[PDB]
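Help needed: design a sequence for this.
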């Protein structure tokens, strides 16, 4: 029926409704650190999030998205392997039922507790919907989360989850600064891939940061209290909303560092 992460509608079933699931540039992938090519021609990333305007947080049934005003160049990503300016539209996480799983990308087969995705679209395309139909339409920054010390800048997000517990619920979420979610270093790996949920379009330049951020056990616990279902429906905890690694096929992962 409709896709999700259960036994009956999980990733292994997606290809029946979205044949691109078995495409040549699907994500996530395992990053083999010893086969990644250092590319000295890659520039440092440029993250300009000082004018970011968050608007709302929403439970869409598969994750929770924090949405930003993208009507102007207020929070942009440029540099790195990118040509042009990419505007931040939303961020969301992928997480597990246990601390040993949850990320979508893996590093030398190592899984992290969760993975943050900052989604950006190429302004040359005018809007998000046009951007996803182009091979260079989106840029996603992926940040791994490990359990350890609490991340102060994540607490405002954690605290509002009770108010969007079920699918379709939303809450005003203004003045949130996404700079509190970045690691200290911007060293990254990059490869051409796709969205990791249906429609799985192959329109993403992935930028995966090498350095994970730490979150406390209590913070990740609060993620696991959300629901996949809508209000008044049988409760299904929102956990394990990650797609397993896909074949690299004809692709090369490049590193910005050595
Ligand atoms: Zn994602």
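Sure. Designed sequence:
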């Amino acid at each position: 029926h409709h896709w999700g992460y259960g036994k009956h509608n999980g990733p292994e079933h997606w290809h029946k409704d979205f044949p691109i699931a078995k495409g040549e540039r699907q994500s996530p992938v395992d990053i083999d650190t010893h086969t990644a090519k250092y590319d000295p021609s890659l520039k440092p990333l440029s993250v300009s999030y000082d004018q970011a305007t968050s608007l709302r947080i929403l439970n869409n049934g598969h994750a929770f998205n924090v949405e930003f005003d993208d009507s102007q160049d207020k929070a942009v990503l440029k540099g790195g392997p990118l040509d042009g300016t990419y505007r931040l539209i939303q961020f969301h996480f992928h997480w597990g039922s246990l601390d040993g799983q949850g990320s979508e990308h893996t590093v030398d087969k190592k899984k992290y507790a969760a993975e943050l995705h900052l989604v950006h679209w190429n302004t040359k395309y005018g809007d998000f919907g046009k951007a996803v139909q182009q091979p260079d339409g989106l840029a996603v920054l992926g940040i791994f989360l490990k359990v350890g010390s609490a991340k102060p800048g994540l607490q405002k997000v954690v605290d509002v989850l009770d108010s969007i517990k079920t699918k379709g619920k939303s809450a005003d979420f203004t003045n949130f600064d996404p700079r509190g979610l970045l690691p200290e270093s911007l060293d990254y790996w990059t490869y051409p891939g796709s969205l990791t949920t249906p429609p799985l379009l192959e329109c993403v330049t992935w930028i995966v940061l090498k350095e994970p951020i730490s979150v406390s056990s209590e913070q990740v616990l609060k993620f696991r209290k959300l629901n996949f279902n809508g209000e008044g429906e049988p409760e299904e905890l929102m956990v394990d909303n990650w797609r397993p690694a896909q074949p690299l096929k004809n692709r090369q992962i490049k590193a910005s560092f050595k």
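The first helix runs from residue 128 to 131.
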